[PDB]
Amino acid sequence: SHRKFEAPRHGNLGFRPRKRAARHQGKVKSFPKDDRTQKVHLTAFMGYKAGMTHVVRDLEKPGSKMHKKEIVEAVTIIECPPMYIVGLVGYVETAQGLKTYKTVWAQHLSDNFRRRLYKNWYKSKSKKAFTKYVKQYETEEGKKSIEASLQAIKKRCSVVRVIAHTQVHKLKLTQKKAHVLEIQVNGGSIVEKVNFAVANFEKTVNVTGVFAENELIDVIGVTKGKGFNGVIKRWGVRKLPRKTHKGLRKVACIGAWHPSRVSTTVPRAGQLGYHHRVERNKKIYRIGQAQPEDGKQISTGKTEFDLTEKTINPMGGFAHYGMVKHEFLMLKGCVAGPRKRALTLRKS
Amino acid sequence: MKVINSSRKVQIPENVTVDVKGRSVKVTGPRGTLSKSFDHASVDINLVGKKELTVDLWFGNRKQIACIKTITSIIENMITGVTKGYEYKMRFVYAHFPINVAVTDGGRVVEIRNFFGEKIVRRIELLDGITCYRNEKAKDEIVLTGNSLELLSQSCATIQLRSAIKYKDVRKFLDGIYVSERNVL
Amino acid sequence: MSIFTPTNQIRLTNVAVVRMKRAGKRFEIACYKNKVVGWRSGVEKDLDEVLQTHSVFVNVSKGQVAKKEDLISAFGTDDQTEICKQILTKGEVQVSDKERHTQLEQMFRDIATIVADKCVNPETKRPYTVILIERAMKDIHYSVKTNKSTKQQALEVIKQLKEKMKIERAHMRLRFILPVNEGKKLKEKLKPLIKVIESEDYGQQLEIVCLIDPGCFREIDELIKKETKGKGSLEVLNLKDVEEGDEKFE
Amino acid sequence: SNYRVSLGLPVGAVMNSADNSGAKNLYVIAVKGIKGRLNRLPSAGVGDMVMATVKKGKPELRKKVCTGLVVRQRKHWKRKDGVYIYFEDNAGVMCNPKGEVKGNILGPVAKECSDLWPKVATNAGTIV
Amino acid sequence: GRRPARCYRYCKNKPYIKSRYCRGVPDAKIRIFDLGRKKASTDEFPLCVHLISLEKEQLSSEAIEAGRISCNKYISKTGGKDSFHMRVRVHPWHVLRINKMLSCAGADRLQTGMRGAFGKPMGTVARVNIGQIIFSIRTRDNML
RNA sequence: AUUAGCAGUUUCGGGGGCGUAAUGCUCUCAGCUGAUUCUCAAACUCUGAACAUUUUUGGUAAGCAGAACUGGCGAUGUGGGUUGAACCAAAUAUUGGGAUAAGACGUCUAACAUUCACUAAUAGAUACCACAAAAGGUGUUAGUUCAUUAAGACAGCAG
RNA sequence: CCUAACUACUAUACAGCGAAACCACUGCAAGGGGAACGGGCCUUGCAAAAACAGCGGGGAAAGAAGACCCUGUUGAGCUUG
RNA sequence: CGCUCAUAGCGACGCUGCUUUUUGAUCCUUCGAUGUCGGCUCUUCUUAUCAUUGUGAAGCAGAAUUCACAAAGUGUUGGAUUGUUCACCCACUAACAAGGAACGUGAGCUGGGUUUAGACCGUCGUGAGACAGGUUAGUUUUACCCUACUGUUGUCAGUU
RNA sequence: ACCUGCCGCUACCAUCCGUUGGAUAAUGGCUGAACGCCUCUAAGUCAGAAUCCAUUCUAGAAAC
């Protein structure tokens, strides 16, 4: 007849293609909308999810029942080694959308960034990626073309993005391909954004400058891949009873005789995890210091009222991770992806 | 039937000068400039020297004949606003709760707190030719004043519309800020 | 065993039925749900119209129509539209699928009407709601029959609680006090609603009137003279027992 | 008022009536506040007001649909300060519609239940 | 109750009167016809105000009686009775028929479905034509 | 089949008023009679013509059941009605040219120009045919009739 | 409630071997008309290789000249004045 | 009717429609076979709106309630009995609205019912047997094809 | 077989997170004719819905 008893839908359709994410690390597909009131600053970064721990803090929500009282809050530790800025790229607005305009690079391209261009780096004898480009900086008949390339960007186009990349090699996973992405600069007056671009070539940007303290950031990432999973555990479907013949972990009826095809909205068994997802409003509790490669152990997990000279690292280190020896930031609640996964943090 | 010719005539006072260029009337008075387009009419707005302005319509029937008196009276509104502009008087009626009213003059806005004992603050900007001020003399009254009637009466109507009792019986409560007088000078 | 459409089913209906049992057999016919009290009052309802079918039934749930082997033997005739009139007049109204409802809801309509007529409490007498005697009539364990008349059934339920409890079985009287100006539209509302005596109206002082009212109708009249006026109006007792109520035992 | 505690007393769960008024247990038939969600049983946490009947007690109250407070349960809930807690038995105490315990509560009363209801604090011996 | 008069609206049958052959037909709902003073001399009321029908149909007796009461009541409230005299210039002679079938859920068993379909008389009906007067009022000239 | 009165009888059968009481005078009021009056019928008649459209019975109805004349579909395509067993045009050997038929003529799609009104709704656009009614509108266009006015009209503002 | 984890053999991948049912042609939809529920015709929406694992919406899916129902001047088992 | 008051809300006597969620009516498709009740499950559509949002009316003082509009975006329950749809209660609730999808959904399930053969009882029949009466036990087959859907590789009409 | 139990997987059985702009409808209005007056409406115009469209989110095309 009709649906006898009315229940909410099993699953969101705003996440519906449910396939493996094509971005291995998490794509910022939208950046914060630029206002020319503000000064120049970056608006994204790339961390690596070290592990997770829980902290104790005294709540300052007036009116609540927990107020000026201790609360155990879980926090994930996102380890953020400093990001090299290695180029800049212009985007002109067009009727079909923004388009990549001229792409000014830097001169000392690191051998970790040049590993993204190379899928088989070891077979290549002379790694010739960005070698005819860096010789433009040697002469001045090529260096002149860099400035006429750059004055095209600071006059003709509207979005200034720095092509910035990380240092995976500084934290030991097993990876030397340095994760690269564009961070759009968000400040007034495009001739200041390209200024902030070229005044940061070959120099690193720490996470403490992009992201402030006690602020909400968004975490773009790729979730934990759980493979070909059935429909219950994928959608949420109530199990069929004990007596069923062909199997009880199914959607029972996948449609009426009258559309006469299975809708795209019927829960079907398929891929779980490795889904691109963002998570908005994840408040940073603490940005941890870098630990020095020449000097004593900086007590990163030392807080007030604790006075124990200890790291953010637990005993035996973080499980299925190394130690957090570069800058980190610990934000409340969980984020997408397991340990050892590249996360693209983003200002809200 | 569509009549062959149906005109009107607008009398320009001597201190006012109209600058009309193809259904775009622009008065200029002693107290301020005002302009409005009438590009939604098949009408030849046209002035006779210095004292007259003759809205005309060739072969209009109805919905077109009906519009020449409208756009004559709107030019007359623009004229009267720039000789002696309109000044509306708005009065507070309340049952028990005395309505407080704030006014600055950045955007000349009005802010209406303690309306029915609501704690929401009814900040409302005015249309962009308009100022207002409280009446020290007559109690519980704010007088609006401006250069255009379509701005002044609409600002007053927004004060009046945003000063209603909701979810109750409107025949009894009657707390609001209503337009009392509609003078000119 | 696996026929592709299962067989015939019950003949559920919405149609009233009348009984006549003659010569050993039980004959019914289908009628209307209200138009059989439109037939046994002397009123005509056009004998074509009082039936939902003209062919005489053995069993109206089974939908079984009789035959002239057991009809000339039973009635002394075989013409069905004369059979249906004898079954209509000299029968008793039997009951359809809604019998349990039209009997249980009838015996729960009966206690919700006949028990609640005129009953005031002890201790400077006041009326009250219906659910207090819905407690105190199962508490006296009343079994309700319908064939005794409803006025007699009213006089029967209060006999048992005059025997058991201390309750009054008559009218009462009140002395309404109302001010002159803001009480006349309260006067002419209850003046064609209930009976009055001693209409003593002034200009300087208050309208004082006395009443002829049942015991139970007071709680309306305590509130309706305030919810229309909007001020205070005074309830002063006059008398607690007048006859020609149910004290004549009609 | 108070937070979400872990609900571990569904519909059809008997619990010991810790109340000096006459009951020996309380059978929870529905919880006041649960709405919706096809085929989900209405669960009671601690602090909840349940509609309950007595399956064992004084016979003068035994077939009525009465109101009760869940003052302790052995489904472990974490308070938001991080500490968990779970009691030894599920328990209840009869009240009015408003939440007035008219008797004396015995045993420990969870302090997620002496929060919402004042009179459950003023008849408790141990508030834990 | 009565079947909707959209069934018996249009006259598609041969006319069918109460006679020796249509035996047990029920009576008409319009009982009395001519209303007003009606002992009035014809010099008194000079004004003939009619009501003619613009489409041809079967104006049912139940409809003529309701229109009769609706016409009587408004003038009796307006100027009192004897200020008019209307007849009614249509009589319900054509009788309607109903092949009544049971409203039972198992109705295949009982009713001869379209077997001996010839219906039993219900009501009557008046077969008005286009431009046929149904309500003729004679009254004074002060009631136009 | 059937509505309403007016007249005569009218004294009567019943009510009464009237001479003090009655087959004695008059009024509804019954009834018999006469001249009127409203609606009238397949089984009434003085008279009385010339599947689809039409005539036509049962049915509330049906793309239902049954008839009568004619034309079709079945048997039959083709052009049109977007589509289609029956509708319109028009009948089929194989073709070329011309003019046509129904139907159309912004594009699909072969074929147009000029002209007068109506529609201001997201409406409306090929009969069968793929729906729509009673009742409404100070929407607009055309129209009929009646009334008001330089003895100062309606409307506005005032006494 | 309200599902979760674990295990062997399956299924899945490879080497080896290797069938059957079914099959007009065959495979995307909406509305229309039609034999009154189209994959095909009409007008639209559209539409871009070759394949894998699942799955049960459709193919009015397959198995079966419908055991129910009716006809037949077709039978049979049983009963009986 | 609503104290007065036709039209707040209703509304007789009548009339005009719509709907295909009831049951009829008919027999056009299907009898070399469309698996036929209910439930569970799951998705989508409808608006004839129960709640929620914005509003307007009331016999809307406040509260509570009632009528209507734009509204289908989001909800619309747990249970006892019964195979039940329906029904009727208890309890929660913002609300527990009405519906379609081949009376959605049996190569999705269950098989309670209906509906074969066993059997019992009641009434009918001389009897074999009948019941559209009650009871009890009673095999639920196949996807590996095409499409649709869910995922996964893969070809991209100067190379990477 | 029982007791404890890593890693992992897991559960409102545990934890975190789940936005702001524009145009509208209903309707309330403004200026204002038709129709010397009136009128939210006819030309214009204002606020306004869990609505609509974007924002953010998911995929990324015989597109660049």
Short mmCIF file of N, CA, C and O in Angstrom, two decimals, chain A residues 99-182:
data_model
loop_
_atom_site.label_atom_id
_atom_site.label_comp_id
_atom_site.label_asym_id
_atom_site.label_seq_id
_atom_site.Cartn_x
_atom_site.Cartn_y
_atom_site.Cartn_z
N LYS A 99 40.64 29.81 -13.56
CA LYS A 99 41.53 28.99 -14.35
C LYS A 99 42.96 29.32 -13.99
O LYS A 99 43.27 30.46 -13.63
N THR A 100 43.84 28.32 -14.07
CA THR A 100 45.24 28.50 -13.72
C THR A 100 45.93 29.38 -14.76
O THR A 100 45.84 29.10 -15.96
N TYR A 101 46.59 30.45 -14.30
CA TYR A 101 47.06 31.49 -15.20
C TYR A 101 48.54 31.38 -15.58
O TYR A 101 48.83 31.20 -16.76
N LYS A 102 49.48 31.49 -14.64
CA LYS A 102 50.87 31.52 -15.11
C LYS A 102 51.89 30.73 -14.29
O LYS A 102 52.92 30.37 -14.87
N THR A 103 51.67 30.47 -13.00
CA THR A 103 52.42 29.50 -12.19
C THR A 103 53.92 29.82 -12.10
O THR A 103 54.76 29.21 -12.76
N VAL A 104 54.24 30.87 -11.34
CA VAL A 104 55.63 31.19 -11.03
C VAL A 104 56.18 30.23 -9.98
O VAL A 104 55.60 30.09 -8.90
N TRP A 105 57.31 29.60 -10.28
CA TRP A 105 57.96 28.68 -9.35
C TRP A 105 59.10 29.38 -8.61
O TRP A 105 59.40 30.55 -8.84
N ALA A 106 59.75 28.64 -7.72
CA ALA A 106 60.94 29.12 -7.03
C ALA A 106 62.18 28.54 -7.71
O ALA A 106 62.09 27.88 -8.75
N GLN A 107 63.35 28.79 -7.12
CA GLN A 107 64.60 28.35 -7.72
C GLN A 107 65.17 27.10 -7.07
O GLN A 107 65.50 26.14 -7.76
N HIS A 108 65.31 27.09 -5.75
CA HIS A 108 65.81 25.90 -5.07
C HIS A 108 64.61 25.04 -4.75
O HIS A 108 63.99 25.15 -3.69
N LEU A 109 64.25 24.18 -5.70
CA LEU A 109 63.22 23.19 -5.50
C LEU A 109 63.84 22.03 -4.73
O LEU A 109 64.90 21.54 -5.11
N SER A 110 63.20 21.62 -3.65
CA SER A 110 63.75 20.55 -2.84
C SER A 110 63.64 19.22 -3.57
O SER A 110 62.81 19.04 -4.46
N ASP A 111 64.50 18.27 -3.20
CA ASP A 111 64.43 16.97 -3.85
C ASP A 111 63.31 16.11 -3.32
O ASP A 111 63.08 15.02 -3.85
N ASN A 112 62.62 16.55 -2.28
CA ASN A 112 61.40 15.88 -1.85
C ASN A 112 60.19 16.38 -2.61
O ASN A 112 59.29 15.60 -2.91
N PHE A 113 60.14 17.68 -2.91
CA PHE A 113 59.04 18.19 -3.72
C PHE A 113 59.12 17.65 -5.14
O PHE A 113 58.10 17.32 -5.74
N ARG A 114 60.33 17.55 -5.69
CA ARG A 114 60.50 17.02 -7.03
C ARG A 114 60.17 15.54 -7.13
O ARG A 114 60.16 14.99 -8.24
N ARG A 115 59.94 14.87 -6.01
CA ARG A 115 59.50 13.49 -6.01
C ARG A 115 58.02 13.34 -6.31
O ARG A 115 57.60 12.24 -6.66
N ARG A 116 57.22 14.39 -6.18
CA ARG A 116 55.82 14.28 -6.59
C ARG A 116 55.70 14.16 -8.09
O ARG A 116 54.79 13.50 -8.59
N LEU A 117 56.60 14.80 -8.83
CA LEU A 117 56.56 14.74 -10.27
C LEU A 117 56.99 13.39 -10.80
O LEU A 117 56.69 13.06 -11.95
N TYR A 118 57.66 12.59 -9.98
CA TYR A 118 58.29 11.35 -10.40
C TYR A 118 57.65 10.17 -9.70
O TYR A 118 57.78 10.02 -8.48
N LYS A 119 56.98 9.30 -10.47
CA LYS A 119 56.39 8.10 -9.89
C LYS A 119 57.41 6.99 -9.70
O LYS A 119 57.27 6.17 -8.78
N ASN A 120 58.42 6.92 -10.56
CA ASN A 120 59.54 6.00 -10.42
C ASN A 120 60.79 6.86 -10.28
O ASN A 120 61.47 7.14 -11.26
N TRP A 121 61.08 7.29 -9.05
CA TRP A 121 62.22 8.17 -8.83
C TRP A 121 63.54 7.43 -8.89
O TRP A 121 64.55 8.00 -9.31
N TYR A 122 63.57 6.16 -8.49
CA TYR A 122 64.83 5.45 -8.42
C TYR A 122 65.34 5.01 -9.78
O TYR A 122 66.55 4.88 -9.97
N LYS A 123 64.45 4.76 -10.74
CA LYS A 123 64.90 4.34 -12.05
C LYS A 123 65.53 5.48 -12.82
O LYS A 123 66.35 5.25 -13.72
N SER A 124 65.15 6.71 -12.50
CA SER A 124 65.63 7.87 -13.23
C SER A 124 67.04 8.19 -12.79
O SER A 124 67.30 8.37 -11.59
N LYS A 125 67.95 8.29 -13.75
CA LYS A 125 69.35 8.55 -13.44
C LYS A 125 69.57 10.02 -13.15
O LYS A 125 69.94 10.40 -12.03
N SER A 126 69.33 10.86 -14.14
CA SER A 126 69.41 12.30 -14.00
C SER A 126 67.99 12.79 -13.75
O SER A 126 67.17 12.81 -14.67
N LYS A 127 67.70 13.16 -12.51
CA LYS A 127 66.37 13.63 -12.18
C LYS A 127 66.21 15.01 -12.79
O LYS A 127 66.68 16.00 -12.22
N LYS A 128 65.58 15.09 -13.96
CA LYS A 128 65.56 16.30 -14.76
C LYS A 128 64.27 17.09 -14.61
O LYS A 128 63.92 17.87 -15.49
N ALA A 129 63.55 16.89 -13.51
CA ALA A 129 62.37 17.70 -13.25
C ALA A 129 62.80 19.04 -12.69
O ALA A 129 63.55 19.09 -11.71
N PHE A 130 62.32 20.11 -13.32
CA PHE A 130 62.65 21.51 -12.99
C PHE A 130 64.15 21.75 -13.04
O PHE A 130 64.77 22.16 -12.06
N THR A 131 64.76 21.47 -14.19
CA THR A 131 66.15 21.82 -14.41
C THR A 131 66.32 22.89 -15.46
O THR A 131 67.17 23.77 -15.29
N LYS A 132 65.54 22.87 -16.53
CA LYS A 132 65.55 24.00 -17.44
C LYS A 132 64.84 25.20 -16.85
O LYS A 132 65.03 26.32 -17.34
N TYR A 133 64.02 25.02 -15.83
CA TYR A 133 63.38 26.15 -15.19
C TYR A 133 64.34 26.89 -14.28
O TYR A 133 64.34 28.12 -14.28
N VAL A 134 65.14 26.18 -13.49
CA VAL A 134 66.00 26.86 -12.53
C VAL A 134 67.17 27.57 -13.21
O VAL A 134 67.81 28.42 -12.58
N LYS A 135 67.44 27.26 -14.47
CA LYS A 135 68.45 27.99 -15.22
C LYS A 135 67.93 29.32 -15.73
O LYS A 135 68.72 30.11 -16.26
N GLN A 136 66.63 29.59 -15.59
CA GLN A 136 66.13 30.93 -15.88
C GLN A 136 66.63 31.92 -14.84
O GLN A 136 66.79 33.11 -15.13
N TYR A 137 66.86 31.45 -13.62
CA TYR A 137 67.41 32.31 -12.58
C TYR A 137 68.90 32.56 -12.76
O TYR A 137 69.45 33.46 -12.12
N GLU A 138 69.58 31.77 -13.59
CA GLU A 138 71.02 31.95 -13.76
C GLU A 138 71.32 33.14 -14.65
O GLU A 138 72.09 34.03 -14.28
N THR A 139 70.72 33.18 -15.83
CA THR A 139 70.84 34.32 -16.72
C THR A 139 69.86 35.41 -16.31
O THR A 139 69.10 35.27 -15.35
N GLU A 140 69.88 36.51 -17.05
CA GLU A 140 68.92 37.59 -16.85
C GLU A 140 68.04 37.81 -18.06
O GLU A 140 67.17 38.69 -18.03
N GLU A 141 68.25 37.06 -19.14
CA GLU A 141 67.29 36.99 -20.23
C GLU A 141 66.19 35.99 -19.93
O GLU A 141 65.14 36.00 -20.58
N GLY A 142 66.39 35.16 -18.91
CA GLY A 142 65.35 34.31 -18.38
C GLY A 142 64.74 34.89 -17.12
O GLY A 142 63.53 34.77 -16.91
N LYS A 143 65.57 35.53 -16.29
CA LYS A 143 65.08 36.15 -15.06
C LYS A 143 64.18 37.34 -15.35
O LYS A 143 63.33 37.70 -14.53
N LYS A 144 64.36 37.97 -16.51
CA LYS A 144 63.47 39.03 -16.94
C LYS A 144 62.08 38.49 -17.23
O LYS A 144 61.07 39.13 -16.91
N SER A 145 62.00 37.28 -17.80
CA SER A 145 60.72 36.64 -18.07
C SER A 145 59.99 36.23 -16.80
O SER A 145 58.77 36.09 -16.84
N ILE A 146 60.71 36.01 -15.70
CA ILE A 146 60.06 35.73 -14.42
C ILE A 146 59.31 36.95 -13.92
O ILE A 146 58.17 36.85 -13.44
N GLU A 147 59.89 38.14 -14.06
CA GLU A 147 59.20 39.33 -13.58
C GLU A 147 58.05 39.73 -14.49
O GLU A 147 57.00 40.15 -14.01
N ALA A 148 58.22 39.58 -15.80
CA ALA A 148 57.09 39.82 -16.70
C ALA A 148 56.03 38.74 -16.60
O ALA A 148 54.88 38.97 -16.97
N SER A 149 56.40 37.55 -16.10
CA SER A 149 55.43 36.54 -15.74
C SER A 149 54.69 36.89 -14.46
O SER A 149 53.52 36.54 -14.31
N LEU A 150 55.37 37.56 -13.54
CA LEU A 150 54.81 37.83 -12.22
C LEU A 150 53.96 39.09 -12.21
O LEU A 150 52.98 39.18 -11.46
N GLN A 151 54.31 40.07 -13.03
CA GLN A 151 53.48 41.26 -13.19
C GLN A 151 52.21 40.97 -13.97
O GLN A 151 51.26 41.75 -13.90
N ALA A 152 52.19 39.88 -14.72
CA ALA A 152 50.94 39.39 -15.27
C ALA A 152 50.01 38.88 -14.19
O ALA A 152 48.80 39.09 -14.27
N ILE A 153 50.56 38.24 -13.16
CA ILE A 153 49.76 37.72 -12.06
C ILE A 153 49.26 38.85 -11.18
O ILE A 153 48.08 38.93 -10.86
N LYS A 154 50.14 39.79 -10.83
CA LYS A 154 49.66 40.85 -9.95
C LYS A 154 48.94 41.97 -10.68
O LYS A 154 48.81 43.07 -10.14
N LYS A 155 48.48 41.75 -11.89
CA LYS A 155 47.56 42.67 -12.54
C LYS A 155 46.34 41.98 -13.11
O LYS A 155 45.23 42.49 -12.96
N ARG A 156 46.49 40.80 -13.71
CA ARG A 156 45.43 40.21 -14.51
C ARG A 156 44.55 39.23 -13.77
O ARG A 156 43.47 38.90 -14.27
N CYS A 157 44.95 38.74 -12.60
CA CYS A 157 44.20 37.66 -11.97
C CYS A 157 43.89 37.97 -10.51
O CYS A 157 44.51 38.83 -9.89
N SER A 158 42.92 37.22 -9.98
CA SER A 158 42.20 37.58 -8.76
C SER A 158 42.51 36.71 -7.55
O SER A 158 42.24 37.14 -6.43
N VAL A 159 43.02 35.50 -7.74
CA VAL A 159 43.30 34.59 -6.63
C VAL A 159 44.78 34.25 -6.67
O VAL A 159 45.32 33.88 -7.72
N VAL A 160 45.45 34.39 -5.53
CA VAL A 160 46.87 34.14 -5.41
C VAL A 160 47.06 32.96 -4.47
O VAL A 160 46.75 33.06 -3.27
N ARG A 161 47.57 31.87 -5.00
CA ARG A 161 47.79 30.66 -4.24
C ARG A 161 49.27 30.31 -4.27
O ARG A 161 49.88 30.30 -5.34
N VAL A 162 49.83 30.04 -3.10
CA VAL A 162 51.20 29.58 -3.00
C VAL A 162 51.19 28.06 -3.03
O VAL A 162 50.42 27.41 -2.33
N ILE A 163 52.01 27.49 -3.90
CA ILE A 163 52.16 26.05 -3.97
C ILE A 163 53.11 25.64 -2.85
O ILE A 163 54.31 25.87 -2.95
N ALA A 164 52.56 25.10 -1.77
CA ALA A 164 53.34 24.80 -0.58
C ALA A 164 53.39 23.31 -0.34
O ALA A 164 52.44 22.59 -0.63
N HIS A 165 54.50 22.83 0.22
CA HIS A 165 54.66 21.40 0.42
C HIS A 165 55.32 21.13 1.76
O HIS A 165 55.97 22.00 2.34
N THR A 166 55.14 19.90 2.25
CA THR A 166 55.56 19.53 3.59
C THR A 166 56.92 18.86 3.60
O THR A 166 57.59 18.70 2.59
N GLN A 167 57.31 18.42 4.79
CA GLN A 167 58.53 17.66 5.00
C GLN A 167 58.12 16.35 5.64
O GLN A 167 58.11 16.22 6.86
N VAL A 168 57.77 15.37 4.80
CA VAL A 168 57.51 14.03 5.32
C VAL A 168 58.81 13.38 5.78
O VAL A 168 58.80 12.58 6.71
N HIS A 169 59.93 13.72 5.14
CA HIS A 169 61.21 13.11 5.45
C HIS A 169 61.72 13.49 6.83
O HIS A 169 62.52 12.74 7.40
N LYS A 170 61.28 14.61 7.38
CA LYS A 170 61.69 15.00 8.71
C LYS A 170 61.00 14.19 9.79
O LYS A 170 61.50 14.11 10.91
N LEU A 171 59.84 13.63 9.50
CA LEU A 171 59.22 12.72 10.49
C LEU A 171 59.33 11.36 9.83
O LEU A 171 59.02 11.27 8.65
N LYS A 172 59.74 10.35 10.55
CA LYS A 172 60.00 9.10 9.81
C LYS A 172 58.75 8.27 9.67
O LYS A 172 58.37 7.65 10.64
N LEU A 173 58.13 8.31 8.50
CA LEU A 173 57.06 7.34 8.17
C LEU A 173 57.85 6.40 7.27
O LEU A 173 58.66 5.66 7.81
N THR A 174 57.61 6.39 5.97
CA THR A 174 58.58 5.68 5.11
C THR A 174 58.61 6.47 3.82
O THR A 174 59.28 6.05 2.89
N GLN A 175 58.08 7.69 3.91
CA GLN A 175 57.75 8.43 2.71
C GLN A 175 58.70 9.60 2.48
O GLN A 175 59.04 10.33 3.42
N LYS A 176 59.12 9.75 1.23
CA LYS A 176 59.92 10.88 0.80
C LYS A 176 59.23 11.74 -0.25
O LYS A 176 59.72 12.84 -0.53
N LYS A 177 58.14 11.28 -0.85
CA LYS A 177 57.28 12.13 -1.65
C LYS A 177 56.64 13.16 -0.74
O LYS A 177 55.80 12.81 0.09
N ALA A 178 57.00 14.42 -0.89
CA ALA A 178 56.54 15.45 0.01
C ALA A 178 55.20 15.97 -0.47
O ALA A 178 55.11 16.47 -1.58
N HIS A 179 54.18 15.88 0.38
CA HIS A 179 52.82 16.22 0.00
C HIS A 179 52.69 17.69 -0.34
O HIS A 179 53.03 18.54 0.48
N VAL A 180 52.20 17.99 -1.54
CA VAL A 180 52.17 19.34 -2.07
C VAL A 180 50.72 19.75 -2.32
O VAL A 180 49.91 18.93 -2.78
N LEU A 181 50.38 20.98 -1.95
CA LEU A 181 49.08 21.55 -2.29
C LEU A 181 49.16 23.06 -2.37
O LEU A 181 50.07 23.68 -1.83
N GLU A 182 48.18 23.66 -3.03
CA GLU A 182 48.08 25.11 -3.08
C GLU A 182 47.32 25.63 -1.89
O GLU A 182 46.23 25.15 -1.58
#
